[PDB]
Design an enzyme around this catalytic site. Structure first.
Site, mmCIF file in Angstrom:
data_model
loop_
_atom_site.group_PDB
_atom_site.id
_atom_site.type_symbol
_atom_site.label_atom_id
_atom_site.label_comp_id
_atom_site.label_asym_id
_atom_site.label_seq_id
_atom_site.Cartn_x
_atom_site.Cartn_y
_atom_site.Cartn_z
ATOM 1 N N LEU A 36 0.852 -1.223 0.130
ATOM 2 C CA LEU A 36 0.043 0.022 0.027
ATOM 3 C C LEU A 36 0.875 1.379 0.181
ATOM 4 O O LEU A 36 0.251 2.337 -0.572
ATOM 5 C CB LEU A 36 -0.994 0.079 1.299
ATOM 6 C CG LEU A 36 -2.118 -1.126 1.424
ATOM 7 C CD1 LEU A 36 -2.707 -0.993 2.705
ATOM 8 C CD2 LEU A 36 -2.847 -1.110 0.053
ATOM 9 N N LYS A 74 2.141 -2.589 8.923
ATOM 10 C CA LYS A 74 3.485 -1.769 8.997
ATOM 11 C C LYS A 74 4.720 -2.257 9.220
ATOM 12 O O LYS A 74 4.791 -2.621 10.562
ATOM 13 C CB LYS A 74 3.232 -0.493 9.602
ATOM 14 C CG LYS A 74 4.098 0.715 9.806
ATOM 15 C CD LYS A 74 3.773 1.787 10.679
ATOM 16 C CE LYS A 74 3.936 2.950 10.152
ATOM 17 N NZ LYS A 74 3.218 3.947 11.088
ATOM 18 N N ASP A 77 1.209 15.085 12.580
ATOM 19 C CA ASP A 77 1.228 14.770 11.070
ATOM 20 C C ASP A 77 -0.208 14.726 10.555
ATOM 21 O O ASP A 77 -0.639 13.891 9.645
ATOM 22 C CB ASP A 77 2.070 13.571 10.837
ATOM 23 C CG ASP A 77 2.480 13.432 9.589
ATOM 24 O OD1 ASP A 77 2.491 14.536 8.705
ATOM 25 O OD2 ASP A 77 2.859 12.236 8.961
#
Ligand SMILES: CCC(=O)Nc1cc(Nc2cc(NC3CC3)n3ncc(C#N)c3n2)ccc1C
Length: 327
Positions: free
Chosen positions: A40, A63, A151
């Site tokens: 991804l 991740k 972020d």
């Protein structure tokens, strides 16, 4: 000196184990339970895959954390554990390691996201109110838990527009807020950096996230995405000042005793503060209201202490139609 207006002491009031992430000892499960399906994307220290848990057939996002200070891994894991169950925060399902290489990976719930470049083109007025309200719940939650995201940007807000689900993702830059701490200003994407970062002011707080949210709100209601489109970190401040005004910038700098990098002398120029109504035209008029402009004006302010908190923003009349609909 500068301190957060809300939640300033909330980490001090908790057990040291809560925020002392370097002391955290994760429980590392077995990555062999997960089958990677599709890549991804990637971060500076991460690679991200869609995957299936073969023991229960659950679809997930994995991740894998490339080389990186184990301290940064502990930070993200501890922050995600502290935020467990938080409203509209991406659910961490598992922390696992390759049992041979010991490379760590984080396993998250899967969200069937609509790419924001396509989505933002089709949002209605009510849609923007709804999603911004939902995102504000995530920010109020993490701020109340003593954590700055640092972020906030469209890429980190996953929206399933069919199921009306929103998750704030990628807590890899998030940090614990402690009053008077000096933080690294090299956070957030260029277009979402608050002026405090662009002028190298290190005593920032949760209000940084509210600048970023304001940028997102502006891009939605006006259909200019990103709203402040700098070519570098210097030009980013110039883009902001062409809207908010230069005299207002200098007042902010003076209040907080902020030294401006002298390369700005050649590029800032002089700019009046612009009325937010100047951004309305036929393509976005149906998304703009007096309430939207009033809210935006209270988010996109130089002075981080004057910006609305996530709770104050949620309470703004702009969101009344959302609150009324949910009852
Ligand atoms: C663990 C992901 C992360 O922290 N950052 C990230 C996410 C990503 N893409 C994604 C993408 C999706 N869904 C899209 C494919 C439909 N989802 N759903 C849940 C999550 C999560 N979490 C997710 N991350 C691409 C690149 C990076 C660096």
């Amino acid at each position: 000196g500068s301190r957060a207006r809300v939640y300033a002491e909330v980490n001090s009031l908790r057990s040291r184990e809560y925020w002392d992430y370097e002391a955290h000892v994760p429980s590392w499960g077995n990555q062999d339970d997960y089958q990677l399906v599709r890549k991804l994307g990637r971060g500076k220290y991460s690679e991200v895959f869609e995957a299936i848990n073969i023991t229960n057939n659950e679809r997930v996002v994995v991740k894998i954390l490339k080389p990186v200070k184990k301290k940064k891994i502990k930070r993200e894991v501890k922050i995600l554990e502290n935020l467990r169950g938080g409203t509209n925060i991406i659910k961490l399902i598992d922390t696992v390691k390759d049992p041979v290489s010991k490379t760590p990976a984080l396993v998250f719930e899967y969200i069937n996201n609509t790419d924001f470049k396509q989505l933002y083109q089709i949002l209605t007025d009510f849609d923007i109110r709804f999603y911004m309200y939902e995102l504000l719940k995530a920010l109020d939650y993490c701020h109340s838990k003593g954590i700055m995201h640092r972020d906030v940007k469209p890429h980190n807000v996953m929206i399933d527009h069919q199921q009306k689900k929103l998750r704030l993702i990628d807590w890899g830059l998030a940090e614990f807020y402690h009053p008077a701490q000096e933080y690294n200003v090299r956070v957030a994407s260029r277009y979402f950096k608050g002026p405090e970062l662009l002028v190298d002011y290190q005593m920032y707080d949760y209000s940084l996230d509210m600048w970023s949210l304001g940028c997102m709100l502006a891009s939605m209601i006006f259909r200019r995405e990103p709203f402040f489109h700098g070519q570098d970190n210097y030009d980013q401040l110039v883009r902001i000042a062409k809207v908010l005004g230069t005299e207002e910038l200098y007042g902010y700098l003076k209040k907080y005793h902020i030294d401006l990098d002298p390369h700005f002398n050649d590029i800032l120029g002089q700019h009046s503060r612009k009325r937010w109504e100047n951004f309305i035209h036929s393509e976005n008029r149906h998304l703009v209201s007096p309430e939207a402009l009033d809210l935006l004006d209270k988010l996109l302010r130089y002075d981080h202490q004057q910006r609305l908190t996530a709770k104050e923003a949620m309470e703004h009349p702009y969101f009344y139609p959302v609150v009324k609909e949910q009852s």
